[PDB]
Short mmCIF file of C-alpha atoms and ligand atoms in Angstrom, two decimals:
data_model
loop_
_atom_site.label_atom_id
_atom_site.label_comp_id
_atom_site.label_asym_id
_atom_site.label_seq_id
_atom_site.Cartn_x
_atom_site.Cartn_y
_atom_site.Cartn_z
CA UNK F 1081 -17.49 -38.48 -17.63
CA UNK F 1082 -15.56 -35.67 -18.68
CA UNK F 1083 -14.99 -31.88 -18.20
CA UNK F 1084 -15.60 -29.61 -21.02
CA UNK F 1085 -12.48 -27.98 -22.78
CA UNK F 1086 -11.66 -24.64 -20.58
CA UNK F 1087 -12.40 -21.21 -21.79
CA UNK F 1088 -10.03 -19.99 -24.22
CA UNK F 1089 -7.28 -17.77 -22.88
CA UNK F 1090 -6.08 -16.48 -26.32
CA UNK F 1091 -7.43 -16.32 -29.59
CA UNK F 1092 -5.69 -14.89 -32.86
CA UNK F 1093 -8.93 -13.74 -34.36
CA UNK F 1094 -9.98 -11.46 -31.16
CA UNK F 1095 -8.50 -8.04 -31.29
CA UNK F 1096 -6.14 -7.61 -28.16
CA UNK F 1097 -5.47 -4.77 -26.09
CA UNK F 1098 -3.76 -3.31 -22.85
CA UNK F 1099 -5.32 -0.54 -21.08
CA UNK F 1100 -4.53 1.26 -17.72
CA UNK F 1101 -7.63 -0.14 -16.35
CA UNK F 1102 -6.96 -3.92 -17.59
CA UNK F 1103 -3.40 -3.31 -16.05
CA UNK F 1104 -5.19 -2.36 -12.61
CA UNK F 1105 -7.57 -5.37 -13.05
CA UNK F 1106 -4.40 -7.71 -13.12
CA UNK F 1107 -2.03 -5.80 -10.70
CA UNK F 1108 -4.34 -4.80 -8.27
CA UNK F 1109 -7.91 -6.69 -8.52
CA UNK F 1110 -6.68 -10.31 -9.66
CA UNK F 1111 -3.73 -10.27 -7.38
CA UNK F 1112 -5.50 -9.38 -4.28
CA UNK F 1113 -8.58 -12.06 -4.77
CA UNK F 1114 -5.74 -14.78 -5.88
CA UNK F 1115 -4.06 -14.62 -2.55
CA UNK F 1116 -7.15 -14.61 -0.26
CA UNK F 1117 -7.63 -17.52 1.95
CA UNK F 1118 -10.85 -18.72 -0.12
CA UNK F 1119 -9.16 -18.12 -3.48
CA UNK F 1120 -8.17 -21.66 -4.51
CA UNK F 1121 -11.48 -23.28 -5.41
CA UNK F 1122 -11.57 -20.53 -8.13
CA UNK F 1123 -7.92 -20.49 -9.29
CA UNK F 1124 -8.78 -22.97 -11.99
CA UNK F 1125 -11.91 -24.86 -13.78
CA UNK F 1126 -14.09 -26.88 -11.62
CA UNK F 1127 -12.99 -30.41 -12.12
CA UNK F 1128 -16.59 -31.89 -12.12
CA UNK F 1129 -15.27 -35.55 -12.51
CA UNK F 1130 -12.94 -35.60 -9.46
CA UNK F 1131 -15.23 -33.55 -7.50
CA UNK F 1132 -17.97 -36.21 -8.42
CA UNK F 1133 -20.27 -33.22 -9.47
CA UNK F 1134 -21.73 -34.95 -12.70
CA UNK F 1135 -24.47 -32.32 -13.11
CA UNK F 1136 -22.01 -29.40 -12.86
CA UNK F 1137 -21.86 -28.59 -16.62
CA UNK F 1138 -25.25 -29.66 -17.12
CA UNK F 1139 -26.51 -26.46 -15.12
CA UNK F 1140 -23.27 -24.27 -15.64
CA UNK F 1141 -23.01 -23.50 -19.31
CA UNK F 1142 -20.94 -20.39 -19.09
CA UNK F 1143 -18.05 -21.65 -16.84
CA UNK F 1144 -15.29 -18.98 -15.48
CA UNK F 1145 -12.50 -18.89 -13.23
CA UNK F 1146 -9.80 -16.82 -11.95
CA UNK F 1147 -6.98 -18.92 -13.61
CA UNK F 1148 -8.65 -18.26 -16.82
CA UNK F 1149 -8.75 -14.74 -16.28
CA UNK F 1150 -5.45 -14.21 -15.03
CA UNK F 1151 -4.34 -15.66 -18.27
CA UNK F 1152 -6.53 -13.65 -20.48
CA UNK F 1153 -5.25 -10.66 -18.53
CA UNK F 1154 -1.48 -11.78 -19.00
CA UNK F 1155 -2.22 -12.48 -22.89
CA UNK F 1156 -4.19 -9.26 -23.37
CA UNK F 1157 -7.19 -11.17 -24.48
CA UNK F 1158 -9.42 -8.46 -23.32
CA UNK F 1159 -10.39 -5.42 -25.50
CA UNK F 1160 -11.43 -3.67 -22.28
CA UNK F 1161 -12.15 -3.71 -18.51
CA UNK F 1162 -16.13 -4.48 -19.11
CA UNK F 1163 -15.08 -7.90 -20.44
CA UNK F 1164 -12.83 -8.73 -17.57
CA UNK F 1165 -15.09 -7.51 -15.10
CA UNK F 1166 -18.05 -9.45 -16.88
CA UNK F 1167 -15.87 -12.58 -16.27
CA UNK F 1168 -15.68 -12.18 -12.50
CA UNK F 1169 -19.37 -11.76 -12.38
CA UNK F 1170 -19.93 -14.69 -14.21
CA UNK F 1171 -17.80 -16.84 -11.87
CA UNK F 1172 -19.52 -15.23 -8.77
CA UNK F 1173 -23.11 -15.76 -10.54
CA UNK F 1174 -22.16 -19.60 -11.33
CA UNK F 1175 -21.35 -20.25 -7.69
CA UNK F 1176 -24.88 -18.76 -6.48
CA UNK F 1177 -26.64 -20.50 -9.13
CA UNK F 1178 -25.25 -23.83 -8.65
CA UNK F 1179 -24.94 -24.22 -4.92
CA UNK F 1180 -27.30 -24.04 -2.00
CA UNK F 1181 -27.48 -20.78 -0.24
CA UNK F 1182 -25.40 -20.81 2.93
CA UNK F 1183 -23.01 -23.59 1.45
CA UNK F 1184 -19.49 -22.96 2.30
CA UNK F 1185 -18.54 -22.27 -1.10
CA UNK F 1186 -21.06 -19.63 -1.36
CA UNK F 1187 -19.87 -17.94 1.55
CA UNK F 1188 -16.38 -18.16 0.03
CA UNK F 1189 -17.58 -16.75 -3.06
CA UNK F 1190 -19.46 -13.89 -1.06
CA UNK F 1191 -16.29 -12.98 0.71
CA UNK F 1192 -14.32 -12.64 -2.59
CA UNK F 1193 -17.01 -10.70 -4.53
CA UNK F 1194 -17.14 -8.31 -1.36
CA UNK F 1195 -13.21 -7.62 -1.98
CA UNK F 1196 -13.75 -7.52 -5.58
CA UNK F 1197 -16.27 -4.75 -5.46
CA UNK F 1198 -14.03 -2.82 -3.06
CA UNK F 1199 -11.19 -3.21 -5.56
CA UNK F 1200 -13.00 -2.39 -8.48
CA UNK F 1201 -14.69 0.77 -6.84
CA UNK F 1202 -11.42 2.46 -7.41
CA UNK F 1203 -10.85 1.53 -11.11
CA UNK F 1204 -8.98 4.22 -12.72
CA UNK F 1205 -10.39 6.09 -15.56
CA UNK F 1206 -9.20 5.41 -19.38
C1 LIG K 2003 -14.55 -21.93 -10.61
C2 LIG K 2003 -15.06 -22.19 -9.20
C3 LIG K 2003 -16.05 -22.40 -9.03
C4 LIG K 2003 -16.92 -22.56 -7.76
N1 LIG K 2003 -16.93 -24.11 -7.15
C5 LIG K 2003 -15.86 -24.67 -6.72
C6 LIG K 2003 -15.86 -25.89 -6.25
C7 LIG K 2003 -14.55 -26.73 -5.85
C8 LIG K 2003 -13.70 -26.44 -6.64
C9 LIG K 2003 -12.23 -27.02 -6.19
C10 LIG K 2003 -12.22 -27.48 -5.21
C11 LIG K 2003 -13.20 -27.61 -4.17
C12 LIG K 2003 -13.15 -28.33 -2.72
O1 LIG K 2003 -12.74 -29.23 -2.53
N2 LIG K 2003 -13.55 -27.38 -1.46
C13 LIG K 2003 -14.02 -26.13 -1.71
C14 LIG K 2003 -13.41 -28.08 -0.37
C15 LIG K 2003 -14.66 -26.94 -4.59
C16 LIG K 2003 -17.18 -26.36 -6.01
C17 LIG K 2003 -17.59 -27.68 -5.33
C18 LIG K 2003 -19.00 -27.46 -5.27
N3 LIG K 2003 -19.47 -26.31 -5.81
C19 LIG K 2003 -18.26 -25.62 -6.25
C20 LIG K 2003 -18.27 -24.10 -6.97
O2 LIG K 2003 -19.22 -23.70 -7.22
#
């Protein structure tokens, strides 16, 4: 049993960019979520092998985690803020799809998502 290769955090063939919105996503949004008490299970890809979740990557085909997002932001991997927002939304959605409603990990994701939405509500223009 193995985990898939993690999502790429850079790619020489994908145009790269920095915008004030992407700077906000790294400096304000990611930072705020990263330090939350519930953040640690989301700071790296799910190790389905060590967690003994053999069906995890049979079900979740678009994995995403905040460690990947952090590195993408640091590497200027994204062209725009929408791409990064989509990664956050993919992470939350994956958690709601794989896990039973009311599971602790779901409650943790829900708290992180509420904070995410509060922070992105003030995403600056441009
Ligand atoms: C990238 C984030 C994915 C979210 N996620 C994380 C873990 C997980 C990851 C690492 C550690 C732990 C853990 O040991 N906990 C929460 C006690 C859980 C887990 C265990 C069952 N379902 C999930 C799950 O959906």
